[PDB]
Amino acid sequence: FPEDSEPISISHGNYTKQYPVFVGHKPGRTQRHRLDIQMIMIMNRTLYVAARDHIYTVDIDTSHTEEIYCSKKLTWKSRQADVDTCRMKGKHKDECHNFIKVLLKKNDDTLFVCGTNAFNPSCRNYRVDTLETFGDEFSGMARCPYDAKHANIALFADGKLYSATVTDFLAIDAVIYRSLGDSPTLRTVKHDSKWLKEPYFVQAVDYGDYIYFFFREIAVEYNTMGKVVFPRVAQVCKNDMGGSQRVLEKQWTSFLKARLNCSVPGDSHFYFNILQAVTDVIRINGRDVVLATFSTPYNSIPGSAVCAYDMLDIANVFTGRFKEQKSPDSTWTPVPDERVPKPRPGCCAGSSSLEKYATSNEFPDDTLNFIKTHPLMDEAVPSIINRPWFLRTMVRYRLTKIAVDNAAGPYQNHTVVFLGSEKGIILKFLARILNGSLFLEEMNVYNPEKCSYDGVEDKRIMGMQLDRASGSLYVAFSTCVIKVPLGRCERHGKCKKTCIASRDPYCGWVRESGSCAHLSPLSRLTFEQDIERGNTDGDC
Amino acid sequence: FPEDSEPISISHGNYTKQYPVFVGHKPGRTQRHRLDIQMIMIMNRTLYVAARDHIYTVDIDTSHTEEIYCSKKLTWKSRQADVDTCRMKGKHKDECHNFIKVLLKKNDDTLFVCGTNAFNPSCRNYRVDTLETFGDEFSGMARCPYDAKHANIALFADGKLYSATVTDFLAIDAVIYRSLGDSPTLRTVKHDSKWLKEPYFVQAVDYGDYIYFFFREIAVEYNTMGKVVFPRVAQVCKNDMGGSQRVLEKQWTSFLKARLNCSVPGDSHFYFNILQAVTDVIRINGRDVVLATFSTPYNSIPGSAVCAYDMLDIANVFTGRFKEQKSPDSTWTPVPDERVPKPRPGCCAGSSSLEKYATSNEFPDDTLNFIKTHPLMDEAVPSIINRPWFLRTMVRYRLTKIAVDNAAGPYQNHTVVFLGSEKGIILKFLARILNGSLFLEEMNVYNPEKCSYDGVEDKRIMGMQLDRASGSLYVAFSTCVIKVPLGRCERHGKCKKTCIASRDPYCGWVRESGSCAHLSPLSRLTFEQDIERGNTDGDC
Amino acid sequence: YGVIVRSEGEDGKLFIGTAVDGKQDYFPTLSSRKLPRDPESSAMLDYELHSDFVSSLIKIPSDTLALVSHFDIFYIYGFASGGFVYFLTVQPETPLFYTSRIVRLCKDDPKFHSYVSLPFGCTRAGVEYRLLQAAYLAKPGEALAQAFNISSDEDVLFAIFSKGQKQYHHPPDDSALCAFPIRAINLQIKERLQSCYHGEGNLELNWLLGKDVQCTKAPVPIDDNFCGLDINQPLGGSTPVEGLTLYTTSRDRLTSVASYVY
Ligand SMILES: *[C@@H]1O[C@H](CO)[C@@H](O[C@@H]2O[C@H](CO)[C@@H](O)[C@H](O)[C@H]2NC(C)=O)[C@H](O)[C@H]1NC(C)=O
Ligand SMILES: *[C@@H]1O[C@H](CO)[C@@H](O[C@@H]2O[C@H](CO)[C@@H](O)[C@H](O)[C@H]2NC(C)=O)[C@H](O)[C@H]1NC(C)=O
Ligand SMILES: *[C@@H]1O[C@H](CO)[C@@H](O)[C@H](O)[C@H]1NC(C)=O
Ligand SMILES: *[C@@H]1O[C@H](CO)[C@@H](O)[C@H](O)[C@H]1NC(C)=O
Ligand SMILES: *[C@@H]1O[C@H](CO)[C@@H](O)[C@H](O)[C@H]1NC(C)=O
Ligand SMILES: *[C@@H]1O[C@H](CO)[C@@H](O)[C@H](O)[C@H]1NC(C)=O
Ligand SMILES: *[C@@H]1O[C@H](CO)[C@@H](O)[C@H](O)[C@H]1NC(C)=O
């Protein structure tokens, strides 16, 4: 089993404590109260920080001091009645508040916002400019979780809201759901564990004719034997209109899922099954891909891995054979194509063989019945290179969040990957070009001095937004958001040896300053970087 | 997932290099050549060191210097013709020698010895006193492996030789076998992977009416899905006489096996499947048990565990329901008792319901046919306490060999366990009394100065013999055998704090010397030890 | 099928290949038995060699019967040529499909270490005929001897094959007559042996071995009359021996063959 490589550079808390931190202060400055940050997102040129009771906005471009200040603040607190109901049902006082868990650009002037609202999920529209709500509050059921600790997906496509969460206080009814957008609402079949079995929702992307959902769930493949969690990707047709009067009315007619394969192959293959995070679709080396982080189960020796998946290999798995169980007592086997109905289950109305069908409502019953009973594909999606790009199996924490710069370097053609973790440690590696990886940097970015207050010391990275234009990776914790420079170039001062040995796409030795600096595609200046090797041949 | 506890004391190579080492020298002293030690065993008061071409004997009781000397030497080299044949078949020159892999007391005057003999396994009888052979050489086929690197089992019971190894040069035909002892020879069914599937043989014990075999093999339980290795225990009746003219003639009629359960239970259970070692039957806390070390698969994040098994829980699994596969395409399920023949498969002739049967030869066909087709039990053997007594999941090496002192302390009633590893590191823990464990000591006993010669530095512990009477644990490496004191008592000199905090059964503070010393059941002197706690309340 | 082997001076032996009716422990699928000149011999039809671990026989493994329902090996034909005996078999393909194979043994090899088995068949015009129906050993005739670049008195195996590898019980009419010079069969086997003894690949005989087994590299010269050692055996292979297609039909299925030279 492959050993953990060493990073070229290590940035200790000693160094990184100088990175600017946001803790919700306006300019001018007094005792701090925990922020309970939920998520961060950059849209346009504004950094949005979703939290308890509030969304804070940060002006990314004019932030130029030791402390990152708040520009504007949205305020949405739960009514007392809702808080009371929440407490009455046995939830702790700290849980019974409005935690913002959905924040999306609806259009150029409108934010779509949902909050747990003390275990009574609710949704509202806000003017982007004034951050004031307009129109009426409306249900967040199936759109926003009740519990701020739960993972959830929300995404707009062509005006329609795709969401994955639970519909009920007790969180028994997990669902993948679509509403709004002048289209019918659709959901996964309630209480059908062949569709979903205790899922943990991770990510959704809009790609082509489909929305793809990434999640993990209990694997029915292992029904017999023990409980095992598998990672999944699932497709739905963007144009789904639901089933007929007789089958899958008001449900998806295009829902299929498949195991993702993240493994180190061997005498026996070693799988990383616990999906932690997935990027948006990224163009890399001429291919549309996502990157994903996986860990081993919590009741096991801890390990993390990063695998990449080509959107074509994903599309491909859904053209293959379906899985089935010939009997409550048999193993799962592929369905022979001869037994697959026409039109093919999972193909969108108005597709090649299906121009005859104006909408899914007109699909025949044998097709709808088949997909209702065979949501699972036989094969697993292969990873690019058929093994992880990156491994960590010698640390006590897990890799979680992931961000990617696919245009790093003077020539904007290197792929650098940033990896967050449970312990506030960021990892940086270069994707060789798509085979392998080089471990550039490990850094401790959690700042106890700015972030450990009001009795909270929680080093879990809750989100990362990479922003090329400001040269930064914004890293969210529960109590603070940190601005981290993409590179530590100027750090090497006048030591050319260290600069060149860094082998870092962002960095190079400039012969006009006699110093190491970050390189920009606008620089007409002459630089020196050896990335393909770190040949020093002293000393500093 | 539970973290690794810290040891109370750590003995670095700095300290342990003073332990006496055997490297095959007679008294008097010259360039050293690798010994290629295979195994060690103490019988009577002599330590036997089985190796290439030789068995070395050490006089345990009169060994009292920095170097452990050879007393006597058995010499058995392969004939040149056998060496030539071996090389001709493509085996490396270093492999084509006589490696001693079987050494057993046949009776008070006779050693039974088998050697790989350059891939032509052969067996001989030796006079214990003179270490000279008498009578003729005879076949080692099925009794001794061809390849010195292969694991094998050999054991006498009532004059009969029980052995597990491969019968063929290519090592395809793995077998559990019995011969000699004026009894019929028996073997497992050749080429029946329900009986054995690429097994790795670990240990056999003689207990009651049965011989129990411990091994690992590919699990047919996971036929569908991937290749998975499971640990097993298997029974055979000591009085087996083989089958009838029509069924299992010349084969076992009593062979049954079962999965061993070594796991940390949880949301999902975490299994240690790769069985490394197993003790002989040991009386502990009024129970007959074996202890066993398990690791994770070689293609996985490394981890080791120690579980204990009660001989009654083992016997018990073999009274339960058999496993079966209702079809080449179904999962493995229990066989209903109504479908189990009478007499019961696996019960020994002349047992309770079976006095009617003088020998297994007279068993009915439905019984023999059933056991021939159902060698596997449904249930797994539970471990004592239903979890490991000891875990190591933060090191790069695996736990392997195991030795146990079940009579440690002034009152000979503590259970101390010694654990070897791939890196020459010994671990020492106390078994709480049967719940849990306390981590007394970690020590590096490999001695580069004495053991790293002739180009070999191999830190793998190949055997351990605990010898109470000489107060020592003898630890075998490929190139050397080390004599390690059971306790490091006198080490604490006059520091009572350290002595008491050691919490070590062997050690105590003697108020007549004002010093820490090892305690013996013969000592009339007054001691002080606090094992149930290490309360110091300074300083040294 | 059987083949009697007895030279001047030798007492005699009988090679038998047979289906075993799923009774793999009762009946060897292929073996050598004594066939003494004296009808009253106390050794008549005994195994040529019987030992605890090594006998002059091949048994079908339980594993194979477990993998394929009603698995069996059918022995269509058998013959002696030069220093070897040959058996032509049909059997289910171990993970329906069937595979037709040539099995070769040295005439003098009581340990059965010489066992080699290779698939065979023929093709013509995009059509594959891989399901053996019948065979017959004969001389080539001048035209075929030329085509095969062999001498006039060298042996040639003539065979009938049905289309494809499926439908053993209900073959289509599409069938072919094919010829295999013994010389090319032996040559392709020798090369398989040499490749294996150079350490390339695996034995590739899943049905008999029950697992992938590596070829062992070893300093052993392989000649036309190599008779095996206890390494690299029994020996299989995935690459078919191709015959020369002589005649095809799609109308009336070919069922038998005999041949001579006039
Ligand atoms: C996960 O991916 C690995 C790598 O592709 C797969 O491993 C291969 O398995 C196939 C058989 O299906 C073998 O032919 C290859 O040799 C294997 N690759 C290697 C390098 O060992 C693995 O099967 C995949 N797992 C699943 C469930 O699809
Ligand atoms: C291995 O041992 C563990 C511990 O006994 C078993 O875990 C139990 O499984 C049963 C169901 O069979 C549950 O009722 C118990 O609650 C489990 N114990 C715990 C503490 O979780 C496990 O099933 C065993 N594995 C096998 C294959 O037998
Ligand atoms: C994005 O930011 C610019 C200013 O940089 C602002 O003028 C514009 O309104 C924003 N674009 C929109 C509305 O998406
Ligand atoms: C990136 O592009 C530049 C030239 O455009 C080249 O020098 C460098 O090698 C390229 N690196 C790649 C292909 O990743
Ligand atoms: C064991 O050792 C004693 C000496 O301590 C010796 O006299 C005796 O022969 C041995 N016992 C046997 C033969 O097992
Ligand atoms: C061992 O025995 C002695 C008395 O015989 C006692 O003091 C000590 O507590 C015992 N420890 C055990 C039971 O393990
Ligand atoms: C045919 O055989 C002859 C010798 O028998 C040989 O010289 C020639 O190479 C062969 N013809 C070919 C292969 O062209």
PDB file of C-alpha atoms in Angstrom, chain B residues 269-437:
ATOM      1  CA  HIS B 269     -18.151  -3.292  12.057  1.00  0.00           C
ATOM      2  CA  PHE B 270     -14.446  -3.023  11.257  1.00  0.00           C
ATOM      3  CA  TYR B 271     -12.839  -6.428  10.744  1.00  0.00           C
ATOM      4  CA  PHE B 272      -9.225  -7.455  11.015  1.00  0.00           C
ATOM      5  CA  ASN B 273      -9.246 -10.378   8.609  1.00  0.00           C
ATOM      6  CA  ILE B 274      -5.592 -11.257   8.015  1.00  0.00           C
ATOM      7  CA  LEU B 275      -4.663 -13.801  10.686  1.00  0.00           C
ATOM      8  CA  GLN B 276      -0.976 -13.488  11.642  1.00  0.00           C
ATOM      9  CA  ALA B 277      -0.401 -15.798  14.652  1.00  0.00           C
ATOM     10  CA  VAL B 278      -2.139 -17.901  17.306  1.00  0.00           C
ATOM     11  CA  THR B 279      -0.898 -19.226  20.651  1.00  0.00           C
ATOM     12  CA  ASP B 280      -1.276 -22.697  22.057  1.00  0.00           C
ATOM     13  CA  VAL B 281      -4.258 -23.267  24.326  1.00  0.00           C
ATOM     14  CA  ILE B 282      -3.759 -21.241  27.509  1.00  0.00           C
ATOM     15  CA  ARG B 283      -5.625 -21.439  30.809  1.00  0.00           C
ATOM     16  CA  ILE B 284      -6.635 -17.876  31.706  1.00  0.00           C
ATOM     17  CA  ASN B 285      -9.164 -16.809  34.333  1.00  0.00           C
ATOM     18  CA  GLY B 286     -10.485 -20.373  34.567  1.00  0.00           C
ATOM     19  CA  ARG B 287     -10.985 -20.661  30.818  1.00  0.00           C
ATOM     20  CA  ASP B 288      -9.188 -22.467  28.010  1.00  0.00           C
ATOM     21  CA  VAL B 289      -8.366 -19.895  25.335  1.00  0.00           C
ATOM     22  CA  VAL B 290      -6.085 -19.020  22.438  1.00  0.00           C
ATOM     23  CA  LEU B 291      -4.913 -15.518  21.578  1.00  0.00           C
ATOM     24  CA  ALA B 292      -4.467 -14.454  17.970  1.00  0.00           C
ATOM     25  CA  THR B 293      -3.086 -11.456  16.100  1.00  0.00           C
ATOM     26  CA  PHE B 294      -4.889 -10.090  13.038  1.00  0.00           C
ATOM     27  CA  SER B 295      -3.967  -7.349  10.558  1.00  0.00           C
ATOM     28  CA  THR B 296      -5.719  -5.440   7.778  1.00  0.00           C
ATOM     29  CA  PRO B 297      -5.002  -6.518   4.175  1.00  0.00           C
ATOM     30  CA  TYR B 298      -1.658  -5.613   2.662  1.00  0.00           C
ATOM     31  CA  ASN B 299      -3.426  -3.421   0.105  1.00  0.00           C
ATOM     32  CA  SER B 300      -4.963  -1.217   2.805  1.00  0.00           C
ATOM     33  CA  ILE B 301      -4.211   1.258   5.569  1.00  0.00           C
ATOM     34  CA  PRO B 302      -2.237  -0.876   8.071  1.00  0.00           C
ATOM     35  CA  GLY B 303      -3.683  -1.958  11.418  1.00  0.00           C
ATOM     36  CA  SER B 304      -3.268  -4.810  13.882  1.00  0.00           C
ATOM     37  CA  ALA B 305      -5.392  -6.332  16.611  1.00  0.00           C
ATOM     38  CA  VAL B 306      -5.267  -9.027  19.274  1.00  0.00           C
ATOM     39  CA  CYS B 307      -8.415 -11.047  19.969  1.00  0.00           C
ATOM     40  CA  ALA B 308      -8.912 -13.978  22.322  1.00  0.00           C
ATOM     41  CA  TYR B 309     -11.073 -17.034  21.702  1.00  0.00           C
ATOM     42  CA  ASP B 310     -12.576 -19.430  24.252  1.00  0.00           C
ATOM     43  CA  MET B 311     -12.205 -23.089  23.237  1.00  0.00           C
ATOM     44  CA  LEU B 312     -15.861 -23.525  24.226  1.00  0.00           C
ATOM     45  CA  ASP B 313     -17.015 -20.793  21.836  1.00  0.00           C
ATOM     46  CA  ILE B 314     -15.042 -22.557  19.121  1.00  0.00           C
ATOM     47  CA  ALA B 315     -16.518 -25.963  19.921  1.00  0.00           C
ATOM     48  CA  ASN B 316     -19.872 -24.168  20.000  1.00  0.00           C
ATOM     49  CA  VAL B 317     -19.734 -22.789  16.462  1.00  0.00           C
ATOM     50  CA  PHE B 318     -19.420 -26.336  15.133  1.00  0.00           C
ATOM     51  CA  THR B 319     -22.730 -27.363  16.737  1.00  0.00           C
ATOM     52  CA  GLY B 320     -24.613 -24.580  14.920  1.00  0.00           C
ATOM     53  CA  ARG B 321     -26.181 -24.382  11.461  1.00  0.00           C
ATOM     54  CA  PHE B 322     -24.201 -25.101   8.288  1.00  0.00           C
ATOM     55  CA  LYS B 323     -23.854 -22.587   5.477  1.00  0.00           C
ATOM     56  CA  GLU B 324     -24.966 -23.269   1.911  1.00  0.00           C
ATOM     57  CA  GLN B 325     -25.498 -21.593  -1.432  1.00  0.00           C
ATOM     58  CA  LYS B 326     -28.982 -22.455  -2.756  1.00  0.00           C
ATOM     59  CA  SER B 327     -27.677 -21.669  -6.245  1.00  0.00           C
ATOM     60  CA  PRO B 328     -24.566 -20.485  -8.111  1.00  0.00           C
ATOM     61  CA  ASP B 329     -26.262 -17.067  -8.108  1.00  0.00           C
ATOM     62  CA  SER B 330     -27.594 -16.704  -4.555  1.00  0.00           C
ATOM     63  CA  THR B 331     -26.158 -15.461  -1.271  1.00  0.00           C
ATOM     64  CA  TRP B 332     -24.926 -17.837   1.420  1.00  0.00           C
ATOM     65  CA  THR B 333     -27.656 -18.838   3.860  1.00  0.00           C
ATOM     66  CA  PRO B 334     -28.006 -21.126   6.887  1.00  0.00           C
ATOM     67  CA  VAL B 335     -29.172 -24.702   6.318  1.00  0.00           C
ATOM     68  CA  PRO B 336     -32.327 -25.522   8.333  1.00  0.00           C
ATOM     69  CA  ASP B 337     -31.672 -28.275  10.860  1.00  0.00           C
ATOM     70  CA  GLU B 338     -34.455 -30.392   9.337  1.00  0.00           C
ATOM     71  CA  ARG B 339     -32.270 -30.805   6.257  1.00  0.00           C
ATOM     72  CA  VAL B 340     -29.256 -31.954   8.291  1.00  0.00           C
ATOM     73  CA  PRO B 341     -28.668 -35.725   8.229  1.00  0.00           C
ATOM     74  CA  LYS B 342     -28.372 -38.080  11.197  1.00  0.00           C
ATOM     75  CA  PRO B 343     -25.871 -38.859  12.510  1.00  0.00           C
ATOM     76  CA  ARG B 344     -24.766 -35.228  12.588  1.00  0.00           C
ATOM     77  CA  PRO B 345     -21.864 -34.321  10.263  1.00  0.00           C
ATOM     78  CA  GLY B 346     -18.742 -33.453  12.224  1.00  0.00           C
ATOM     79  CA  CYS B 347     -19.510 -35.582  15.259  1.00  0.00           C
ATOM     80  CA  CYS B 348     -16.883 -38.203  16.062  1.00  0.00           C
ATOM     81  CA  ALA B 349     -17.590 -41.929  15.820  1.00  0.00           C
ATOM     82  CA  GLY B 350     -18.334 -43.369  19.268  1.00  0.00           C
ATOM     83  CA  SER B 351     -19.725 -40.030  20.445  1.00  0.00           C
ATOM     84  CA  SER B 352     -23.095 -39.684  22.211  1.00  0.00           C
ATOM     85  CA  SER B 353     -25.568 -40.468  19.433  1.00  0.00           C
ATOM     86  CA  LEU B 354     -22.891 -42.425  17.599  1.00  0.00           C
ATOM     87  CA  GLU B 355     -21.811 -45.379  19.768  1.00  0.00           C
ATOM     88  CA  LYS B 356     -23.446 -47.457  17.044  1.00  0.00           C
ATOM     89  CA  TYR B 357     -20.531 -46.527  14.744  1.00  0.00           C
ATOM     90  CA  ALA B 358     -17.201 -48.207  15.440  1.00  0.00           C
ATOM     91  CA  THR B 359     -15.410 -45.878  13.000  1.00  0.00           C
ATOM     92  CA  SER B 360     -16.122 -43.147  10.468  1.00  0.00           C
ATOM     93  CA  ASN B 361     -15.856 -45.820   7.756  1.00  0.00           C
ATOM     94  CA  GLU B 362     -19.304 -47.018   8.808  1.00  0.00           C
ATOM     95  CA  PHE B 363     -20.921 -43.567   8.609  1.00  0.00           C
ATOM     96  CA  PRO B 364     -23.946 -43.464   6.271  1.00  0.00           C
ATOM     97  CA  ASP B 365     -23.676 -41.845   2.837  1.00  0.00           C
ATOM     98  CA  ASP B 366     -26.137 -38.993   3.388  1.00  0.00           C
ATOM     99  CA  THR B 367     -23.997 -37.849   6.322  1.00  0.00           C
ATOM    100  CA  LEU B 368     -20.697 -38.152   4.428  1.00  0.00           C
ATOM    101  CA  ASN B 369     -22.153 -36.552   1.294  1.00  0.00           C
ATOM    102  CA  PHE B 370     -23.532 -33.661   3.329  1.00  0.00           C
ATOM    103  CA  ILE B 371     -20.266 -32.810   5.097  1.00  0.00           C
ATOM    104  CA  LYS B 372     -18.343 -33.220   1.836  1.00  0.00           C
ATOM    105  CA  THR B 373     -20.551 -30.492   0.384  1.00  0.00           C
ATOM    106  CA  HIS B 374     -20.983 -28.330   3.521  1.00  0.00           C
ATOM    107  CA  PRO B 375     -17.587 -27.925   5.205  1.00  0.00           C
ATOM    108  CA  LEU B 376     -18.407 -24.336   6.200  1.00  0.00           C
ATOM    109  CA  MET B 377     -20.420 -23.252   9.274  1.00  0.00           C
ATOM    110  CA  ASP B 378     -22.830 -20.305   9.058  1.00  0.00           C
ATOM    111  CA  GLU B 379     -21.746 -18.362  12.141  1.00  0.00           C
ATOM    112  CA  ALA B 380     -18.470 -16.669  13.036  1.00  0.00           C
ATOM    113  CA  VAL B 381     -16.696 -17.386  16.344  1.00  0.00           C
ATOM    114  CA  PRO B 382     -17.211 -14.502  18.796  1.00  0.00           C
ATOM    115  CA  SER B 383     -14.145 -13.125  20.532  1.00  0.00           C
ATOM    116  CA  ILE B 384     -13.868 -12.909  24.318  1.00  0.00           C
ATOM    117  CA  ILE B 385     -15.333  -9.496  25.196  1.00  0.00           C
ATOM    118  CA  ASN B 386     -16.546  -9.221  21.578  1.00  0.00           C
ATOM    119  CA  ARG B 387     -13.793  -6.800  20.583  1.00  0.00           C
ATOM    120  CA  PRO B 388      -9.985  -6.735  20.477  1.00  0.00           C
ATOM    121  CA  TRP B 389      -8.012  -6.761  23.726  1.00  0.00           C
ATOM    122  CA  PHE B 390      -5.368  -4.649  21.998  1.00  0.00           C
ATOM    123  CA  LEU B 391      -5.106  -2.382  18.946  1.00  0.00           C
ATOM    124  CA  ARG B 392      -2.317  -0.688  16.966  1.00  0.00           C
ATOM    125  CA  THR B 393      -3.466   1.537  14.095  1.00  0.00           C
ATOM    126  CA  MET B 394      -0.974   4.405  14.151  1.00  0.00           C
ATOM    127  CA  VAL B 395       2.219   2.571  13.173  1.00  0.00           C
ATOM    128  CA  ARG B 396       3.571   1.485   9.781  1.00  0.00           C
ATOM    129  CA  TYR B 397       4.231  -2.123  10.767  1.00  0.00           C
ATOM    130  CA  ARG B 398       2.051  -5.091  11.682  1.00  0.00           C
ATOM    131  CA  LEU B 399       1.808  -7.166  14.846  1.00  0.00           C
ATOM    132  CA  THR B 400       2.772 -10.780  14.184  1.00  0.00           C
ATOM    133  CA  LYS B 401       4.083 -13.224  16.785  1.00  0.00           C
ATOM    134  CA  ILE B 402       2.518 -13.634  20.208  1.00  0.00           C
ATOM    135  CA  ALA B 403       3.642 -15.137  23.523  1.00  0.00           C
ATOM    136  CA  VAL B 404       1.788 -15.262  26.844  1.00  0.00           C
ATOM    137  CA  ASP B 405       2.770 -15.577  30.481  1.00  0.00           C
ATOM    138  CA  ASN B 406      -0.366 -16.629  32.353  1.00  0.00           C
ATOM    139  CA  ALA B 407       1.377 -16.827  35.738  1.00  0.00           C
ATOM    140  CA  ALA B 408       3.234 -13.532  36.073  1.00  0.00           C
ATOM    141  CA  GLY B 409       3.681 -11.786  39.417  1.00  0.00           C
ATOM    142  CA  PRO B 410       4.422 -12.707  43.058  1.00  0.00           C
ATOM    143  CA  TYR B 411       1.114 -14.559  43.081  1.00  0.00           C
ATOM    144  CA  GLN B 412       1.448 -16.049  39.589  1.00  0.00           C
ATOM    145  CA  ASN B 413      -1.957 -14.777  38.600  1.00  0.00           C
ATOM    146  CA  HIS B 414      -1.489 -11.975  36.157  1.00  0.00           C
ATOM    147  CA  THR B 415      -1.712 -12.424  32.389  1.00  0.00           C
ATOM    148  CA  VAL B 416       0.994 -10.615  30.440  1.00  0.00           C
ATOM    149  CA  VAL B 417       1.067 -10.745  26.654  1.00  0.00           C
ATOM    150  CA  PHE B 418       4.131 -10.214  24.461  1.00  0.00           C
ATOM    151  CA  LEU B 419       3.638  -9.147  20.839  1.00  0.00           C
ATOM    152  CA  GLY B 420       6.277  -9.282  18.091  1.00  0.00           C
ATOM    153  CA  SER B 421       6.171  -7.228  14.867  1.00  0.00           C
ATOM    154  CA  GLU B 422       7.656  -6.848  11.358  1.00  0.00           C
ATOM    155  CA  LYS B 423      10.074  -4.193  12.647  1.00  0.00           C
ATOM    156  CA  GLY B 424      11.656  -6.043  15.572  1.00  0.00           C
ATOM    157  CA  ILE B 425       9.531  -4.142  18.074  1.00  0.00           C
ATOM    158  CA  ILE B 426       8.127  -6.044  21.070  1.00  0.00           C
ATOM    159  CA  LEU B 427       4.911  -4.904  22.755  1.00  0.00           C
ATOM    160  CA  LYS B 428       3.917  -5.853  26.295  1.00  0.00           C
ATOM    161  CA  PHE B 429       0.451  -5.565  27.793  1.00  0.00           C
ATOM    162  CA  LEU B 430      -1.393  -6.811  30.867  1.00  0.00           C
ATOM    163  CA  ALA B 431      -4.744  -8.537  30.357  1.00  0.00           C
ATOM    164  CA  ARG B 432      -7.181  -7.068  32.889  1.00  0.00           C
ATOM    165  CA  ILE B 433      -9.227  -9.638  34.819  1.00  0.00           C
ATOM    166  CA  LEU B 434     -11.122 -10.872  31.079  1.00  0.00           C
ATOM    167  CA  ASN B 435     -11.970  -7.316  30.006  1.00  0.00           C
ATOM    168  CA  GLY B 436      -9.555  -4.892  28.351  1.00  0.00           C
ATOM    169  CA  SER B 437      -5.808  -4.307  28.616  1.00  0.00           C
TER     170      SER B 437
END
